[PDB]
Write an enzyme that holds these catalytic residues in place. Structure first.
Site, PDB file in Angstrom:
ATOM      1  N   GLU A  35       0.969  -1.452   0.393  1.00 33.29           N
ATOM      2  CA  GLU A  35       0.111   0.474   0.085  1.00 33.29           C
ATOM      3  C   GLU A  35       0.625   1.467  -0.237  1.00 33.29           C
ATOM      4  OE1 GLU A  35      -2.812   2.965  -0.011  1.00 33.29           O
ATOM      5  OE2 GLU A  35      -3.022   0.923  -0.556  1.00 33.29           O
ATOM      6  N   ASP A  66      10.003   8.303  -1.714  1.00 34.83           N
ATOM      7  CA  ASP A  66       9.845   8.557  -2.795  1.00 34.83           C
ATOM      8  C   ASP A  66      10.852   9.889  -2.983  1.00 34.83           C
ATOM      9  OD1 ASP A  66       8.001  11.175  -2.844  1.00 34.83           O
ATOM     10  OD2 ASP A  66       6.815   9.865  -2.247  1.00 34.83           O
ATOM     11  N   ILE A  87      -4.017  13.274   5.674  1.00 33.15           N
ATOM     12  CA  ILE A  87      -4.078  11.769   5.361  1.00 33.15           C
ATOM     13  C   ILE A  87      -3.958  10.775   5.483  1.00 33.15           C
ATOM     14  CG2 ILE A  87      -2.936  11.502   2.939  1.00 33.15           C
ATOM     15  CD1 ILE A  87      -2.656  14.188   2.202  1.00 33.15           C
ATOM     16  N   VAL A  90      -7.694  10.184   8.622  1.00 35.48           N
ATOM     17  CA  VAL A  90      -8.824   9.730   8.184  1.00 35.48           C
ATOM     18  C   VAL A  90      -8.840   8.757   7.065  1.00 35.48           C
ATOM     19  CG1 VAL A  90     -10.651  10.726   6.362  1.00 35.48           C
ATOM     20  CG2 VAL A  90      -9.476  12.231   8.665  1.00 35.48           C
ATOM     21  N   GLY A  92      -5.789  -0.257  -3.107  1.00 33.86           N
ATOM     22  CA  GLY A  92      -6.278   1.251  -2.759  1.00 33.86           C
ATOM     23  C   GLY A  92      -6.523   1.503  -2.043  1.00 33.86           C
ATOM     24  N   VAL A  93      -6.458   0.972  -0.900  1.00 28.89           N
ATOM     25  CA  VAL A  93      -7.468   0.765   0.900  1.00 28.89           C
ATOM     26  C   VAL A  93      -6.729   2.580   1.609  1.00 28.89           C
ATOM     27  CG1 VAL A  93      -7.113  -1.289   0.774  1.00 28.89           C
ATOM     28  CG2 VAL A  93      -5.117   0.204   2.153  1.00 28.89           C
TER      29      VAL A  93
HETATM   30  C1  LIG Z   1       5.417   6.821  -0.182  1.00 30.42           C
HETATM   31  C2  LIG Z   1       3.836   7.813  -0.380  1.00 30.42           C
HETATM   32  N1  LIG Z   1       4.334   9.269  -1.364  1.00 30.42           N
HETATM   33  C3  LIG Z   1       3.275   9.363  -0.970  1.00 30.42           C
HETATM   34  C4  LIG Z   1       2.599  10.813  -1.880  1.00 30.42           C
HETATM   35  O1  LIG Z   1       3.334  11.532  -2.515  1.00 30.42           O
HETATM   36  N2  LIG Z   1       1.443  11.187  -1.556  1.00 30.42           N
HETATM   37  C5  LIG Z   1       1.287  12.740  -1.964  1.00 30.42           C
HETATM   38  N3  LIG Z   1      -0.010  12.985  -2.408  1.00 30.42           N
HETATM   39  C6  LIG Z   1      -0.384  13.952  -2.950  1.00 30.42           C
HETATM   40  C7  LIG Z   1      -0.959  15.010  -2.298  1.00 30.42           C
HETATM   41  O2  LIG Z   1      -2.148  14.481  -2.392  1.00 30.42           O
HETATM   42  C8  LIG Z   1      -3.311  15.411  -1.762  1.00 30.42           C
HETATM   43  C9  LIG Z   1      -4.391  14.179  -1.488  1.00 30.42           C
HETATM   44  C10 LIG Z   1      -5.013  13.182  -2.380  1.00 30.42           C
HETATM   45  C11 LIG Z   1      -5.971  12.560  -1.970  1.00 30.42           C
HETATM   46  C12 LIG Z   1      -6.531  12.559  -1.442  1.00 30.42           C
HETATM   47  C13 LIG Z   1      -6.497  13.565   0.435  1.00 30.42           C
HETATM   48  C14 LIG Z   1      -5.381  13.871  -0.264  1.00 30.42           C
HETATM   49  C15 LIG Z   1      -1.392  16.116  -3.430  1.00 30.42           C
HETATM   50  C16 LIG Z   1       0.171  17.280  -3.650  1.00 30.42           C
HETATM   51  C17 LIG Z   1       0.469  18.469  -4.504  1.00 30.42           C
HETATM   52  O3  LIG Z   1      -1.181  19.207  -4.683  1.00 30.42           O
HETATM   53  O4  LIG Z   1       1.402  18.907  -4.339  1.00 30.42           O
HETATM   54  C18 LIG Z   1       1.755  15.599  -3.610  1.00 30.42           C
HETATM   55  C19 LIG Z   1       0.932  15.068  -2.901  1.00 30.42           C
HETATM   56  S1  LIG Z   1       2.612  13.854  -3.031  1.00 30.42           S
HETATM   57  C20 LIG Z   1       1.574   9.236   0.436  1.00 30.42           C
HETATM   58 CL1  LIG Z   1       0.500   9.455   0.573  1.00 30.42          CL
HETATM   59  C21 LIG Z   1       2.926   8.041   0.476  1.00 30.42           C
HETATM   60 CL2  LIG Z   1       2.604   6.681   1.797  1.00 30.42          CL
END
Ligand SMILES: Cc1[nH]c(C(=O)Nc2nc3c(OCc4ccccc4)cc(C(=O)O)cc3s2)c(Cl)c1Cl
Length: 193
Positions: A35, A66, A87, A90, A92-93
């Site tokens: 996950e 990463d 995140i 609260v 693909g679980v």
């Molecule tokens: C090892 C790892 N890496 C990540 C990751 O990089 N997640 C990310 N989500 C995000 C992201 O997601 C926000 C989000 C997406 C879906 C539901 C809630 C919040 C947004 C932005 C942005 O706008 O710059 C950047 C990132 S980086 C996650 Cl989560 C994990 Cl665990």
């Protein structure tokens, strides 16, 4: 918000096999890693991550690092805590399942010139996400210690199970570099199609 988060974490702990897979035959244990890795792969699919490092630590915790954007750190208005904490907690679980089923989880984010760190125990943050220093890098590192209140019998990670899936993901996301490192015995692999 706090009461709903604790109830959601509790829901995952009450029916863990349903969220992560069998908690006695090692399936759920290895799915915890998959996950976290899947979230890093999603960051590669979106065009931001080029390298993922998966480490089996000597204490049978696993980290995934990463070089993507970093989980956002700014305060999320509804909850009044960092977006990262929302995140992580609260439901693909979702990585929040891994947090719920971890005795401890360490989060380190490099984003917008700063390093940010937070620790959780059984999904409960120990303090608000905090700045630990400056960086010119970006990315996310999650290290987790699976809860032995959830995982029974198979509790030690199997290098070969992780290596097979990471080779698959390197082939299917050609362009991503995935490193696997075992600090228990010094084994290392590098998958890059
Ligand atoms: C090892 C790892 N890496 C990540 C990751 O990089 N997640 C990310 N989500 C995000 C992201 O997601 C926000 C989000 C997406 C879906 C539901 C809630 C919040 C947004 C932005 C942005 O706008 O710059 C950047 C990132 S980086 C996650 Cl989560 C994990 Cl665990």
């Amino acid at each position: 918000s706090s009461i709903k988060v604790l109830k959601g974490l509790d829901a995952v702990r009450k029916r863990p096999g349903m969220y992560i897979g069998d908690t006695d035959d090692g399936t759920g244990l290895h799915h915890m890693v998959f996950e976290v890795v899947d979230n890093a792969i999603d960051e590669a699919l979106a065009g931001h991550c080029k390298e993922i490092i998966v480490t089996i630590h000597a204490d049978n915790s696993v980290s995934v690092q990463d070089d993507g954007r970093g989980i956002p750190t700014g305060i999320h208005p509804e909850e009044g805590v960092s977006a990262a904490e929302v995140i992580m907690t609260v439901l693909g679980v979702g990585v929040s399942v891994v947090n719920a089923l971890s005795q401890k989880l360490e989060l380190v984010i490099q984003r917008e010139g700063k390093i940010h760190r937070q620790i959780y125990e059984h999904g409960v943050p120990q303090a608000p996400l905090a700045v630990t220093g400056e960086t010119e890098k970006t990315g996310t590192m999650v290290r987790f210690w699976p809860s032995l209140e959830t995982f029974t019998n198979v509790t030690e990670f199997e290098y070969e199970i992780l290596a097979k899936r990471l080779r698959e993901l390197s082939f299917l996301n050609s362009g991503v570099s995935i490193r696997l490192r075992d600090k228990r015995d010094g084994k290392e692999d590098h998958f890059h199609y």
